[PDB]
């Protein structure tokens, strides 16, 4: 290569980045191709390319051209392709191109162009491609386009065209591709596209078309049509009557309201049809003649029925998406074997008959979610073999079929609260992921199976109470609480000659602790009855009356004990201050305390699942709670009262028989807080994300600490009370009498 620019042996030169400011010099007399691009030449002087009469491919891309002399391109009768993109010339050079009559490809795209002169593109009888993309012209040049009739592919995209006049492309008979996208077209004349007999692909994308064009019916041989991301409101009947060979339509991202029934019929070559959000349509489109469809999506419409001949007529269908409609009953899906995916979700289907899905040989994915399904036939899923996904969630199901579902990897059943049955893992041999309404159903399943509702030690799989020592301690708590509470009540009831307010209050709190003992006994007997089988009992226990009774008893006992402790301290203070007759007023106060405890216990009954959070039936579950307000209320209500009584006993201590049993009440307060304030703060702990604690610890510490005050009060009264021993002597005397 004489020139510094490298040159191929087959008389072809390639220069790029050499930074020349002129035409190459010293180059071969004859040359086929010449590519000078990313250079710094701006203007082409006279007969610059005359030195190469044999040139047949010429590239000046990104060279930043601004002026082409009219005679510069003269004499290149052998030119075949000419590329000029990303330059600074603002108009098509009408004179320069006229110097040649033999090239076939001419690119003038991506270079800001404002006006196309009228007799530009004249004499170019051999041109076949034209790139006018990403320029700035605002009106198609009708006469210059009509100058040459032999063009095939034309791009006018990324421009500022707003309207194309009638008969704009009337003389372009050989055109095969026309690109009009990312323009500003909003008005489309109805006599503009005529004459493009051989046009096969039309692109009208990202424009501002407000109504469906009526001109496309003038061009018959259309194959691909793209009008997407335009503001098209409705699609009229007979829109595609003039395009029988039509094979692809792109109409997504248009905000649609109404589509005519006859819009898409008689399109034999159509392969995929997608309609989203056509709200104003309410009947299935007439698809007669469209037999090659392999994907059909109709989402967001108001359709209520599916034709019974749909899947038996569209033999090639493989995907069917009909979601967010309002469909009552499904047709028979037999007669088609290529249907692989089916989506019928967010509809109003209420039942699945036996023959609905029978016959789908190739079905793999099924979606029946957010519906009103209430019963599925036992044989519904038997026929379909290679199913992998099944999604029937947020329906109203009471029972689920196990026939033909062995091979599915994923099954989803959440929100079917009426479904209390047990899923046997023998039926689902292979299953990677599972979602069930309740954790106790997933307890029976466990490369490994993942289950959405976790059994985080607060939904025990085997043992309700848990560790053997914990269960023994709870049994001992219940037994001692029941017997000593019964003994104290018997002694106080029998030694009834005169009833002081303090002795009445001690009897009443011992009465309230007996219900705590009853709750603990309920828990112990339930655990004993369901040992190693609590997966089969948690279902009914939580969603039943037993949990309500147990939770009511627990809350009532705790609140009654706290309130009676408060009044006992108030009574002690008033007595220490001193016919008085507050004794009858204190009985009234006791009645209100019991009345308030009953109200507090009954409050969660009318709420939503407050007692159903835990098998214990306590309102203090793991992490998230059914109602944060109630549990937050109860603890501060209790801690508040604790602080009061504490301050009244502080006042009594400052101030200093009547002095007797003061220590007993103080010990009662002491034990009641050391067994409540710890568990109150700890149950408060999961709300604070800073502190983390294991669910096994919570559950275990909750169970052994909740009834401990009921265990400890009567033994404290029995062993450390001269009054109790005298009452027991009175009991012995009355029994002997």
């Amino acid at each position, epitope marked *: 290569c004489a020139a510094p620019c490298s040159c191929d042996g087959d008389r072809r030169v390639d220069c790029s980045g050499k930074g020349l400011t002129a035409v190459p010099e010293g180059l071969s007399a004859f040359t086929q191709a010449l590519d000078i691009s990313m250079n710094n030449i701006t203007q082409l002087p006279e007969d610059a390319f005359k030195n190469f009469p044999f040139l047949e491919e010429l590239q000046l891309a990104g060279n930043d051209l601004s002026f082409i002399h009219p005679k510069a391109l003269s004499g290149l009768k052998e030119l075949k392709v000419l590329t000029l993109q990303n330059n600074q010339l603002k108009t098509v050079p009408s004179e320069a191109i006229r110097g040649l009559s033999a090239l076939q490809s001419l690119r003038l795209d991506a270079n800001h162009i404002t006006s196309v*002169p009228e007799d530009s593109f004249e004499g170019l009888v051999q041109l076949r491609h034209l790139w006018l993309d990403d320029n700035s012209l605002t009106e198609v040049p009708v006469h210059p386009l009509s100058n040459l009739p032999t063009l095939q592919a034309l791009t006018l995209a990324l421009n500022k065209i707003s309207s194309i006049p009638d008969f704009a492309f009337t003389n372009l008979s050989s055109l095969v591709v026309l690109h009009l996208h990312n323009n500003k077209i909003r008005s489309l004349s109805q006599h503009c596209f005529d004459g493009l007999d051989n046009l096969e692909t039309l692109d009208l994308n990202y424009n501002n078309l407000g109504e469906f064009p009526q001109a496309i019916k003038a061009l018959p041989s259309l194959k691909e049509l793209g009008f997407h991301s335009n503001s098209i409101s409705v699609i009229p009947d007979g829109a595609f009557d003039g395009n029988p060979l039509l094979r692809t339509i792109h109409l997504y991202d248009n905000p649609l309201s109404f589509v005519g029934n006859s819009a898409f019929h008689n399109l034999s070559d159509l392969h995929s049809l997608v309609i989203r959000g056509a709200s104003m349509v309410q009947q299935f489109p007439n698809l007669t003649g469209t037999v090659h469809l392999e994907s059909l999506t109709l989402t967001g419409t108001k359709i209520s029925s599916i034709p019974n001949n749909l899947c038996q007529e569209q033999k090639m269908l493989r995907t069917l998406d009909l979601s967010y409609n309002n469909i009552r009953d499904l047709p028979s899906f037999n007669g088609c074997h290529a249907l692989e995916e089916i989506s019928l979700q967010r509809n109003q289907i209420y039942q699945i008959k036996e023959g609905t899905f029978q016959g789908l040989i190739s079905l793999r994915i099924l979606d029946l979610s957010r519906n009103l399904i209430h019963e599925i036939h036992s044989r519904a899923f038997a026929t379909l073999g290679p199913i992998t996904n099944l999604d029937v969630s947020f329906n109203e199901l009471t029972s689920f079929p196990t026939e033909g579902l062995n091979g599915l990897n994923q099954l989803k059943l959440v929100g079917n609260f009426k479904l209390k049955e047990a899923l046997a893992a023998k039926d689902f041999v292979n299953l990677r992921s599972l979602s069930v309404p309740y954790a106790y159903q997933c307890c029976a399943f466990w490369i490994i199976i993942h289950c959405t509702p976790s059994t985080g030690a607060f939904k025990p799989c085997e043992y309700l109470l848990g560790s053997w020592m914990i269960r023994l301690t709870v049994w001992f708590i219940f037994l001692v609480a029941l017997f000593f509470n019964l003994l104290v009540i018997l002694t106080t009831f029998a030694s009834c000659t005169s009833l002081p307010s303090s002795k009445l209050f001690i009897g009443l709190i011992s009465v309230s602790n007996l219900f705590m003992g009853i709750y603990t006994g309920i828990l112990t007997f339930l655990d004993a009855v369901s040992w190693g089988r609590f997966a089969e009992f948690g279902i009914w226990w939580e969603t039943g009356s037993g949990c309500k009774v147990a939770g009511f008893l627990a809350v009532f006992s705790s609140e009654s004990a706290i309130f009676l402790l408060m009044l006992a301290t108030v009574e002690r203070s008033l007595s220490a201050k001193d016919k008085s007759n507050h004794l009858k007023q204190f009985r009234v106060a006791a009645l209100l305390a019991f009345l308030g405890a009953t109200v507090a216990g009954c409050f969660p009954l009318f709420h939503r699942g407050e007692y159903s959070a835990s098998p214990l039936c306590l309102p203090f579950p793991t992490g998230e709670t059914p109602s944060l307000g109630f549990t937050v209320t109860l603890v501060l209500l209790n801690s508040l009262a604790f602080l009061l009584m504490a301050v009244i006993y502080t006042k009594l201590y400052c101030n200093l028989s009547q002095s007797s049993m003061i220590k007993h009440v103080a010990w009662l307060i002491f034990t009641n807080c050391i067994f409540f304030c710890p568990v109150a703060f700890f149950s408060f702990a999961p709300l604070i994300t800073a502190i983390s604690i294991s669910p096994e610890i919570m559950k275990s510490v909750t169970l052994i600490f909740f009834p401990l005050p009921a265990c400890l009060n009567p033994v404290l009264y029995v062993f450390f009370n001269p009054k109790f021993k005298e009452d027991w002597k009175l009991l012995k005397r009355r029994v002997t009498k």
Partner: nanobody
Amino acid sequence: LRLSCAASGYTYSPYCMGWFRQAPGKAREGVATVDLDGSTIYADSVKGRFTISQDNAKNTLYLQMNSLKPEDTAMYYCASRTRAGVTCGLNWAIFSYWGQGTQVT
């Protein structure tokens, strides 16, 4: 200032005919255009200050301006068209013949 262009060929007045400006490194821009019936066309920043005279008998072209701006330093060209007077022209595309021009400082 006065500056004139002489046409070697026959008078191009019945066809598009005018003046262009060249600034180093950027595109050629037209400033004066003569058409049928002596109609004159100028660009945005040529009104009044820049003017063009045309006649057919003497076969020359005159361009006159006033009160000079160093801003206006450039090489000027006189250009003409002969065939298919499709439209009045301010861009270089529709001009076939170009002259040597002169540098104005």
